Amino acid sequence: EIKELLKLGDLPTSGQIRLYDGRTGEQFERPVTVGYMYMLKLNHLVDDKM
Amino acid sequence: DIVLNPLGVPSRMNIGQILETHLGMAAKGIGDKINAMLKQQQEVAKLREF
Amino acid sequence: ARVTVQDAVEKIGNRFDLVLVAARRARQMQVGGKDPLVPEENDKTTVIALREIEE
Amino acid sequence: GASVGIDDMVIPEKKHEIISEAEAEVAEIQEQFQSGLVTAGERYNKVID
Amino acid sequence: EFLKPRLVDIEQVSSTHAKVTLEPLERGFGHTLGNALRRILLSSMPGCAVTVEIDGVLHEYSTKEGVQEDILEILLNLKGLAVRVQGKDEVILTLNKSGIGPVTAADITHDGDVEIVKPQHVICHLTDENASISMRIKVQRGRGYVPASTRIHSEEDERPIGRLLVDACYSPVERIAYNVEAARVEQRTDLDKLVIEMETNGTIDPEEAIRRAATILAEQLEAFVDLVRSANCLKAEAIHYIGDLVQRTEVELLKTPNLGKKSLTEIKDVLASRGLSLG
Amino acid sequence: SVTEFLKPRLVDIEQVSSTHAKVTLEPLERGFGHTLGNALRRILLSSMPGCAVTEVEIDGVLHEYSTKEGVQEDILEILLNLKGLAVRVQGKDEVILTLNKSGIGPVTAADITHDGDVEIVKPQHVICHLTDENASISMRIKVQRGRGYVPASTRRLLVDACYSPVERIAYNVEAARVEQRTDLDKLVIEMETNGTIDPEEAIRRAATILAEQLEAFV
Amino acid sequence: TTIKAAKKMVEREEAVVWDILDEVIREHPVLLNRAPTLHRLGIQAFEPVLIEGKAIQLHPLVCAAYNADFDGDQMAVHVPLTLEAQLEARALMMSTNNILSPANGEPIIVPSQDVVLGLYYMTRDCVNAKGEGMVLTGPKEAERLYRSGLASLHARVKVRITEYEKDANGELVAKTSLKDTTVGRAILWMIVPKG
Amino acid sequence: KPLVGTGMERAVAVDSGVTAVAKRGGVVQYVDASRIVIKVNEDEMYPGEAGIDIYNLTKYTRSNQNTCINQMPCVSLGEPVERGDVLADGPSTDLGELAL
RNA sequence: CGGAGAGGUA
Ligand SMILES: [Mg+2]
């Protein structure tokens, strides 16, 4: 069902896309997985610990 | 936005962050096809079908 | 560049008296103004003292 | 750029055949113990093997 | 022997989506120039951003009446305002509206040297006819990202309670998408084109951004070589600077009727610190 | 101040004796360290004028897997000594030389014919070793002018011409601190050459080539 | 002029005190230590490097000794004062002097999780790749070949190397021959020392 | 509003006290950054002088862990509200859904 | 410029 959802929109069904370097403009081999993950921010700041 | 370490996945077996990454990219692709139909004028008839 | 002290400790194989002789030598350089037996590259008395015992 | 995806963990093609063969063995080797041939202790040491 | 590139075509999909082309390119120069221009368009590009005082507020953590949004939320959506200024580098806009209804960017002042790119940008919402909002949007011009937290010098001037600092994000470029590919035959193979696909918030021109990043790149490649009563008493004698008064002793200044009692006392107080008027 | 970018002050230029230097650009802006460092790096290796050896034929051998008596090395091994040879050539495009010599001892670069404009920069470079008093070596080396590296498959024995006169280049971005600012790059470029041109002058070459590619925009 | 004058200068943080702080930081080692100090390898001496921020940077090779990952670990810093304390930090507990564990002569500076994978990718040997079956004049030509996009990192190629051998009484015989290897292994040879 | 969820985001958000659930239905008569006014229906109003409902949204305050606790309205004038609908989004809330 | 208890981090 995830692959079928990736086929409705124009997106690669494999899930892994091919990225380029940002400092050298080169192409990385072994195309990597790129997506959207939901990250959280814990209440452990460096200002309250230094 | 985020560059995670891929070698942390096989050590601690948490595959849920791999399917969520694929499913999160899929959910964004359905949000880009609608944003395209909303950035430019499109009848509600086309939006009710997709 | 005082990265390691391998060649220093190979001469005198104690690693304890070296700190003692270097503390007295570096103190004579700091306490009283003097020219180091070796040229300086904006270093301190500790680095100059260990660099002197290298020979 | 050595990433890790969902397709990088391939399931063997005969995994379903081994499990189906394994559950078929247990479905009849357990009944052999009920006939009084082997004890529950030795049967326990057999199913785990 | 190198076929230098030329700005061939500039496409325009919308007011924000552009597509430029750089041809002809030699071998190994597509990625060499594509990446080098992308690293400048994203990093440093001039732009304008809101740097605003509301009438009935004292801090962004307060709340006004007749407004559905929040004071901090108002300062949040003012950040994403596409402003274009060509005349000066420091403008002060004004937004006044009353009555039930949303508050878009059209309602803001219509200064001659201020162009609003997205007039339908919703800024606030009014919910009572007996209410009004009045603010002065101080717009500036710069490059990069500068947060309001860095404005804690407290050695230049002080700000009233009414002033509210906002995070400055004057960077019009959003993303750069170049792609090298084989060009036409051109009676000579091994020629590639560079198709840059930029995107901005309608506050910059495609040509004006490529001719500007390349200028910055060439500007860095040149490093390729080997290696008032008290003051009025002194101003009466055509002496305005402290150097003219310090050149003469305090005795010589006291022998003139232009100096007064308050001026002599102020000069003596400044001389007590051994800073000036030391003969 | 909207276009007031900092300029690096190369206060230190340390170089090894003959064919190795180490330039340190400082201070640069945030992100220009990798920008400028990689811009000249890709050009230095992939687009650099120079002359090298393209094809050499043997007067009595027409195969790679062969051998000649009296030679301590092999025919595949002597190809490397022809690749590692650095030759500076005049405005002429190409010219063929020879290695006609019969004698006991290592064959150095001084045994090659002068051939006028052909100026060998490393006369100490040894091509092959000879041990018999009658074993004679003879070949026809053909130089050519190009830009970059051309392998054998991209193209008498073939020779992978290394036109680029730079052996290696690897920049290294570091951190430099202004009186108050600290997040500024510090470029450190390390590069070795093949003796044809000094590495210090090699930077000015590619930097000029890249500066000429931006004339239609500036 | 006086002790009070210097305090107000540091208090206002003039642009000149930063270049004066760099003087003492240059050759004054500091001691780093974490909470669970089990063995003696948990307190080592390092040279401070001023960096903007509020976080300490620890070399990713001594993390094995400290047993400290990067999920929220904290450490404590200590600054020696006297001459003897500074000399003991350099000659007895310097990070470049404690590479062998006190329990066994085996090293403790083994890298992992990004260095052992990276070198495994260079030293890898593919079957069919662009550049297979060619000849390179050494490791320097291999680096030029790979970065130019002309050959893969894992492709068999005969490369000539000059490996010194100090097995004699001070003499180093410079053996030169043609070894069969790949592009990746050849580039890595530019790091391996003479002996 | 996390795109990948388990459907248990509205349950936690509504059962918590950080939101402002509409007691009785009606139509929003006056929405505000700190107040909400909804005209209750004719049936949902008590017989003897019922009136309306007024919700006073909390402003910027501090929690036990020194964190900001404020609500934000998510309705508009004229919008018909029904009993049980969410009228404000407190800390970590997006249209009546948990978002951390 | 304290004493107990609770929670949390490595
Ligand atoms: Mg830990």
Side-chain angles (χ1 to χ4, degrees), chain A, chain B, chain C, chain D, chain E residues 1-183 186 188-227 231 236 238 243 257 260 272 275 279, chain F residues 1-132 134-218, chain G, chain H:
Chain A
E1 298 180 347
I2 302 180
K3 296 184 178 181
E4 181 180 0
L5 175 55
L6 284 170
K7 288 186 178 183
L8 181 63
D10 299 330
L11 293 178
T13 316
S14 179
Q16 311 184 59
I17 65 177
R18 179 172 56 94
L19 298 190
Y20 301 92
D21 200 332
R23 307 176 306 173
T24 67
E26 298 178 0
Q27 164 187 328
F28 299 112
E29 308 88 359
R30 310 292 304 270
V32 301
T33 297
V34 179
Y36 281 80
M37 189 179 179
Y38 190 66
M39 300 298 301
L40 282 70
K41 179 182 179 180
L42 304 188
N43 55 333
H44 298 272
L45 305 176
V46 74
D47 298 1
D48 305 330
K49 302 175 180 300
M50 185 187 62
Chain B
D1 301 329
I2 297 298
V3 179
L4 292 178
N5 197 330
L7 289 86
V9 183
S11 180
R12 38 260 181 170
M13 305 159 297
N14 42 21
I15 318 295
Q17 64 177 343
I18 304 298
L19 292 95
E20 182 181 0
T21 304
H22 297 173
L23 192 63
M25 185 71 258
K28 192 63 177 181
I30 314 297
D32 297 0
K33 188 63 178 182
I34 300 179
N35 184 27
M37 299 179 178
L38 264 63
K39 197 64 177 181
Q40 64 184 2
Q41 277 63 28
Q42 286 288 345
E43 297 182 359
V44 298
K46 184 58 181 300
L47 287 176
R48 187 165 294 183
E49 180 267 356
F50 170 78
Chain C
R2 210 68 177 94
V3 177
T4 57
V5 291
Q6 184 195 227
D7 301 0
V9 302
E10 286 183 6
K11 297 299 180 179
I12 303 96
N14 203 331
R15 211 177 187 91
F16 284 161
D17 299 0
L18 284 313
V19 185
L20 300 180
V21 301
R24 297 179 56 182
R25 189 62 185 90
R27 182 162 305 281
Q28 297 178 359
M29 303 178 183
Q30 192 179 203
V31 181
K34 200 214 301 169
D35 50 328
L37 298 190
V38 294
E40 68 188 56
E41 47 276 0
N42 299 330
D43 300 0
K44 302 185 179 305
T45 60
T46 60
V47 182
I48 294 300
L50 298 180
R51 187 167 177 261
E52 174 173 326
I53 322 294
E54 171 64 29
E55 64 179 352
Chain D
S3 63
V4 44
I6 195 65
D7 299 330
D8 300 329
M9 302 176 299
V10 52
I11 296 181
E13 291 77 307
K14 50 184 176 180
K15 173 180 176 57
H16 172 265
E17 299 182 359
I18 300 177
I19 298 301
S20 181
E21 183 180 358
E23 62 179 359
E25 181 68 22
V26 187
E28 53 90 85
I29 201 59
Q30 183 68 22
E31 314 298 331
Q32 306 296 333
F33 146 80
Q34 304 293 339
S35 180
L37 178 60
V38 80
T39 61
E42 186 176 357
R43 178 213 62 88
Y44 168 79
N45 301 331
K46 179 185 56 55
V47 182
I48 63 179
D49 276 55
Chain E
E1 187 181 357
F2 288 96
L3 301 180
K4 302 182 301 300
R6 288 294 183 269
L7 220 177
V8 179
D9 190 9
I10 297 180
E11 203 186 32
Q12 191 69 15
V13 187
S14 60
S15 61
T16 58
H17 189 187
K19 183 181 301 300
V20 204
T21 303
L22 275 74
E23 183 178 2
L25 286 198
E26 284 287 344
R27 294 259 56 91
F29 274 88
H31 306 272
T32 304
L33 292 179
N35 182 266
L37 293 179
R38 183 182 187 277
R39 290 186 59 84
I40 305 180
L41 292 172
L42 297 179
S43 60
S44 60
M45 285 305 300
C48 299
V50 175
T51 299
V52 50
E53 310 181 1
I54 318 180
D55 49 72
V57 305
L58 298 180
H59 49 70
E60 56 275 2
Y61 303 90
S62 61
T63 173
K64 200 180 178 60
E65 301 177 1
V67 42
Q68 181 180 355
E69 277 67 23
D70 196 357
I71 303 302
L72 181 60
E73 179 173 33
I74 292 181
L75 303 189
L76 193 149
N77 55 51
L78 282 173
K79 164 186 171 300
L81 184 61
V83 189
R84 180 191 298 269
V85 179
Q86 60 281 354
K88 296 183 177 182
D89 304 332
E90 189 181 30
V91 197
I92 300 179
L93 275 66
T94 303
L95 173 60
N96 302 327
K97 193 183 181 300
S98 61
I100 301 182
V103 182
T104 60
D107 302 321
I108 320 180
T109 184
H110 194 61
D111 193 6
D113 58 328
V114 174
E115 176 182 353
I116 300 299
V117 187
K118 189 172 185 178
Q120 64 278 4
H121 177 56
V122 179
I123 302 179
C124 168
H125 287 273
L126 292 178
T127 171
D128 184 67
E129 60 278 358
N130 300 331
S132 60
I133 300 183
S134 63
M135 60 181 61
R136 306 189 309 268
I137 299 181
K138 178 181 179 180
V139 187
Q140 296 182 354
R141 168 179 290 271
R143 59 174 174 90
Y145 170 79
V146 176
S149 61
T150 58
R151 314 168 186 176
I152 54 179
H153 51 276
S154 178
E155 199 179 4
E156 178 183 0
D157 58 79
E158 297 292 336
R159 60 244 59 179
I161 309 300
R163 191 180 308 266
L164 298 178
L165 299 180
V166 193
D167 297 329
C169 298
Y170 27 64
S171 180
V173 179
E174 301 291 338
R175 62 180 182 91
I176 302 299
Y178 70 97
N179 51 270
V180 192
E181 60 179 3
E186 307 290 342
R188 170 182 173 88
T189 342
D190 301 1
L191 298 181
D192 295 356
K193 62 176 59 182
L194 180 61
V195 182
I196 301 180
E197 178 182 356
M198 63 174 59
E199 180 174 342
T200 180
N201 58 336
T203 49
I204 202 180
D205 187 73
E207 180 192 17
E208 297 177 2
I210 298 184
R211 294 183 175 270
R212 199 181 195 94
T215 303
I216 301 178
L217 188 54
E219 192 177 359
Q220 298 293 340
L221 295 176
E222 56 86 18
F224 64 163
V225 300
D226 199 333
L227 206 159
Chain F
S1 60
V2 193
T3 332
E4 192 272 326
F5 294 90
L6 275 66
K7 292 303 180 303
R9 194 271 177 268
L10 34 141
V11 73
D12 196 337
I13 301 182
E14 186 178 0
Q15 58 176 358
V16 198
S17 178
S18 65
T19 56
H20 187 185
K22 182 180 181 180
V23 187
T24 299
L25 299 180
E26 175 185 11
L28 287 78
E29 290 283 352
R30 187 188 64 177
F32 286 165
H34 300 85
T35 307
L36 298 181
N38 177 80
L40 51 87
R41 184 193 59 85
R42 291 177 51 88
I43 299 181
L44 240 81
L45 301 179
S46 179
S47 300
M48 200 64 176
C51 300
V53 183
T54 298
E55 50 188 9
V56 180
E57 58 178 359
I58 308 299
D59 61 332
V61 170
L62 300 179
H63 183 54
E64 299 81 6
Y65 293 156
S66 299
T67 178
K68 178 179 297 299
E69 301 294 335
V71 180
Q72 297 291 153
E73 295 78 10
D74 299 330
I75 308 181
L76 185 59
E77 182 175 359
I78 64 180
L79 298 179
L80 294 85
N81 301 90
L82 303 176
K83 300 180 61 179
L85 180 61
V87 179
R88 51 182 62 181
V89 189
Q90 210 66 22
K92 301 299 296 180
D93 182 69
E94 59 184 10
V95 63
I96 180 179
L97 291 80
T98 182
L99 194 61
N100 298 332
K101 181 188 179 184
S102 59
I104 303 180
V107 178
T108 60
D111 303 329
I112 317 181
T113 172
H114 192 62
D115 202 356
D117 304 330
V118 181
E119 178 182 0
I120 305 300
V121 76
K122 296 181 58 181
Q124 198 179 0
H125 182 64
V126 183
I127 299 182
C128 59
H129 294 0
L130 269 61
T131 178
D132 294 339
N134 300 330
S136 180
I137 178 62
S138 180
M139 61 182 60
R140 297 183 179 271
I141 167 182
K142 174 183 177 181
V143 306
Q144 193 180 359
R145 182 181 304 271
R147 299 188 305 268
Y149 192 90
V150 186
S153 59
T154 312
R155 300 295 299 181
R156 182 177 300 180
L157 302 180
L158 280 66
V159 177
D160 301 2
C162 48
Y163 303 109
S164 299
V166 284
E167 299 286 62
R168 67 176 304 270
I169 171 178
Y171 66 97
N172 184 22
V173 183
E174 295 182 0
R177 49 163 307 275
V178 202
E179 306 176 0
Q180 182 63 216
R181 297 183 176 182
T182 319
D183 52 330
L184 291 194
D185 300 334
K186 177 184 176 180
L187 183 58
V188 178
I189 300 180
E190 181 176 1
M191 159 190 45
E192 280 180 314
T193 180
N194 68 335
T196 57
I197 54 179
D198 47 321
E200 175 64 26
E201 194 273 329
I203 299 183
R204 313 190 188 99
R205 291 293 182 89
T208 305
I209 298 179
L210 185 57
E212 295 177 1
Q213 302 293 339
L214 303 180
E215 298 295 337
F217 308 97
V218 177
Chain G
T1 61
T2 181
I3 310 297
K4 309 300 179 180
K7 295 173 180 173
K8 272 68 180 181
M9 184 180 299
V10 182
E11 175 67 24
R12 296 184 299 268
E13 299 184 358
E14 266 66 24
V16 68
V17 308
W18 299 104
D19 296 329
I20 304 299
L21 177 58
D22 209 338
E23 305 293 337
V24 294
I25 298 299
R26 191 178 292 101
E27 288 100 2
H28 194 171
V30 295
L31 302 181
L32 280 68
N33 174 43
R34 206 162 69 96
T37 307
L38 301 179
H39 53 13
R40 85 170 200 174
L41 298 179
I43 301 182
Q44 303 180 3
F46 298 86
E47 295 183 356
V49 177
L50 264 59
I51 43 93
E52 182 178 1
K54 296 182 178 181
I56 304 179
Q57 297 182 356
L58 181 65
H59 205 252
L61 294 187
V62 300
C63 300
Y66 284 84
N67 193 20
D69 49 357
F70 297 104
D71 56 356
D73 295 18
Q74 306 177 22
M75 297 193 308
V77 295
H78 298 274
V79 181
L81 303 180
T82 61
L83 280 72
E84 293 78 6
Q86 295 178 5
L87 293 174
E88 288 171 347
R90 289 179 172 267
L92 300 175
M93 48 184 176
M94 179 54 63
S95 179
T96 52
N97 296 338
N98 302 330
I99 68 173
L100 306 182
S101 60
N104 43 14
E106 299 182 349
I108 201 60
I109 325 289
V110 279
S112 58
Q113 298 181 192
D114 38 11
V115 182
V116 292
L117 180 58
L119 272 66
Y120 178 80
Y121 188 82
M122 303 184 300
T123 56
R124 196 65 175 272
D125 47 330
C126 180
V127 166
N128 185 87
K130 48 183 301 179
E132 181 185 1
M134 63 184 301
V135 175
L136 296 179
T137 330
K140 301 180 181 302
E141 195 179 26
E143 180 181 357
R144 185 217 318 268
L145 177 65
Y146 170 73
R147 304 307 295 269
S148 301
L150 304 172
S152 179
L153 191 61
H154 36 59
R156 300 181 182 92
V157 48
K158 299 181 179 300
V159 181
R160 175 191 296 180
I161 40 87
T162 305
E163 42 177 350
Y164 298 92
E165 190 177 8
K166 209 179 181 181
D167 57 349
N169 46 16
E171 316 298 330
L172 292 85
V173 42
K175 178 182 179 182
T176 301
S177 61
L178 271 61
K179 302 299 182 179
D180 180 70
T181 177
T182 61
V183 182
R185 306 170 185 177
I187 303 179
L188 189 55
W189 176 249
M190 314 185 66
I191 300 180
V192 189
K194 304 168 60 181
Chain H
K1 49 131 182 62
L3 306 178
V4 182
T6 59
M8 293 296 304
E9 290 75 13
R10 297 183 178 269
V12 184
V14 171
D15 295 1
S16 58
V18 298
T19 60
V21 184
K23 300 176 299 180
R24 302 190 303 268
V27 182
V28 174
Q29 185 179 1
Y30 171 78
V31 66
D32 194 4
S34 179
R35 298 199 309 174
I36 294 178
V37 172
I38 295 184
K39 179 59 180 300
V40 201
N41 289 10
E42 70 286 344
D43 53 354
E44 302 180 4
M45 280 178 58
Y46 297 92
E49 299 182 3
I52 60 164
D53 298 330
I54 297 181
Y55 306 90
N56 297 270
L57 306 185
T58 172
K59 276 302 146 183
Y60 296 87
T61 183
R62 59 174 303 272
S63 63
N64 299 21
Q65 286 73 13
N66 302 329
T67 61
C68 173
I69 302 296
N70 60 330
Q71 293 177 311
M72 293 178 58
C74 58
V75 296
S76 59
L77 301 180
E79 181 179 1
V81 180
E82 199 70 22
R83 175 180 176 88
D85 296 334
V86 183
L87 301 177
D89 303 330
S92 299
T93 306
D94 197 319
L95 272 63
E97 293 184 359
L98 188 60
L100 305 178

Short mmCIF file of all heavy atoms in Angstrom, two decimals, chain G residues 34 36 66-74, chain I residues 10, ligand 1:
data_model
loop_
_atom_site.label_atom_id
_atom_site.label_comp_id
_atom_site.label_asym_id
_atom_site.label_seq_id
_atom_site.Cartn_x
_atom_site.Cartn_y
_atom_site.Cartn_z
N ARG G 34 35.02 12.36 32.28
CA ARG G 34 33.59 12.08 32.35
C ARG G 34 33.24 11.62 33.76
O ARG G 34 34.09 11.50 34.64
CB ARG G 34 33.20 11.05 31.29
CG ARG G 34 31.75 11.14 30.83
CD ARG G 34 31.52 10.42 29.52
NE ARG G 34 31.65 8.97 29.64
CZ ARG G 34 30.62 8.15 29.81
NH1 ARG G 34 29.38 8.63 29.88
NH2 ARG G 34 30.82 6.84 29.91
N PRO G 36 31.69 8.49 34.85
CA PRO G 36 32.09 7.15 35.28
C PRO G 36 33.56 6.85 35.00
O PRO G 36 33.88 6.10 34.07
CB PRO G 36 31.17 6.24 34.47
CG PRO G 36 30.98 6.98 33.20
CD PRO G 36 31.03 8.45 33.53
N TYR G 66 37.12 6.81 26.76
CA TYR G 66 36.15 7.47 27.63
C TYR G 66 34.82 6.72 27.69
O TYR G 66 34.05 6.95 28.63
CB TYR G 66 35.91 8.90 27.17
CG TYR G 66 37.02 9.87 27.52
CD1 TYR G 66 38.14 9.99 26.71
CD2 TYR G 66 36.95 10.66 28.66
CE1 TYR G 66 39.16 10.87 27.02
CE2 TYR G 66 37.96 11.54 28.98
CZ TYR G 66 39.06 11.65 28.16
OH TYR G 66 40.07 12.52 28.48
N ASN G 67 34.55 5.85 26.72
CA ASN G 67 33.27 5.14 26.63
C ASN G 67 32.10 6.13 26.61
O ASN G 67 31.15 6.02 27.38
CB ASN G 67 33.13 4.13 27.77
CG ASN G 67 31.99 3.15 27.55
OD1 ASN G 67 31.52 2.97 26.42
ND2 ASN G 67 31.53 2.52 28.62
N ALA G 68 32.20 7.11 25.71
CA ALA G 68 31.23 8.20 25.63
C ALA G 68 30.70 8.28 24.21
O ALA G 68 31.46 8.54 23.26
CB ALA G 68 31.87 9.52 26.05
N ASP G 69 29.39 8.07 24.05
CA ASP G 69 28.72 8.27 22.78
C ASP G 69 28.29 9.73 22.67
O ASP G 69 28.73 10.59 23.44
CB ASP G 69 27.55 7.30 22.64
CG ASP G 69 26.66 7.28 23.86
OD1 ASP G 69 26.98 7.98 24.84
OD2 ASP G 69 25.64 6.55 23.83
N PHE G 70 27.41 10.03 21.71
CA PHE G 70 26.99 11.41 21.49
C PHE G 70 25.47 11.53 21.56
O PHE G 70 24.85 12.14 20.69
CB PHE G 70 27.50 11.93 20.15
CG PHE G 70 29.00 11.98 20.06
CD1 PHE G 70 29.70 11.03 19.33
CD2 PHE G 70 29.71 12.98 20.70
CE1 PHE G 70 31.08 11.07 19.25
CE2 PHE G 70 31.09 13.03 20.61
CZ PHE G 70 31.77 12.07 19.89
N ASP G 71 24.87 10.95 22.60
CA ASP G 71 23.43 11.02 22.81
C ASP G 71 23.07 11.88 24.02
O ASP G 71 21.93 11.83 24.49
CB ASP G 71 22.84 9.62 22.96
CG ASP G 71 23.50 8.82 24.07
OD1 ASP G 71 24.47 9.32 24.68
OD2 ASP G 71 23.04 7.69 24.34
N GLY G 72 24.01 12.67 24.53
CA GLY G 72 23.74 13.53 25.66
C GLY G 72 24.78 13.46 26.76
O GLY G 72 24.58 14.00 27.85
N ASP G 73 25.91 12.79 26.48
CA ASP G 73 26.96 12.67 27.48
C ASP G 73 27.57 14.02 27.80
O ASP G 73 27.64 14.91 26.95
CB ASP G 73 28.05 11.71 26.99
CG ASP G 73 27.55 10.29 26.84
OD1 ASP G 73 26.32 10.09 26.76
OD2 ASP G 73 28.39 9.37 26.80
N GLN G 74 28.01 14.18 29.05
CA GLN G 74 28.67 15.39 29.52
C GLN G 74 29.99 15.02 30.18
O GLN G 74 30.14 13.93 30.76
CB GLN G 74 27.79 16.17 30.50
CG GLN G 74 26.40 16.50 29.97
CD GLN G 74 25.54 17.20 31.01
OE1 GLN G 74 26.06 17.80 31.95
NE2 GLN G 74 24.23 17.13 30.83
P A I 10 19.90 9.43 28.67
OP1 A I 10 19.68 9.33 27.20
OP2 A I 10 19.16 8.53 29.58
"O5'" A I 10 21.46 9.25 28.95
"C5'" A I 10 22.42 10.00 28.22
"C4'" A I 10 23.80 9.86 28.81
"O4'" A I 10 23.85 10.50 30.11
"C3'" A I 10 24.27 8.44 29.08
"O3'" A I 10 24.75 7.78 27.92
"C2'" A I 10 25.32 8.63 30.16
"O2'" A I 10 26.55 9.07 29.58
"C1'" A I 10 24.72 9.78 30.96
N9 A I 10 23.96 9.30 32.13
C8 A I 10 22.60 9.19 32.25
N7 A I 10 22.21 8.73 33.42
C5 A I 10 23.40 8.53 34.11
C6 A I 10 23.67 8.05 35.40
N6 A I 10 22.73 7.68 36.27
N1 A I 10 24.97 7.98 35.78
C2 A I 10 25.91 8.35 34.91
N3 A I 10 25.78 8.82 33.67
C4 A I 10 24.48 8.88 33.32
MG MG J 1 26.64 7.99 26.95
#
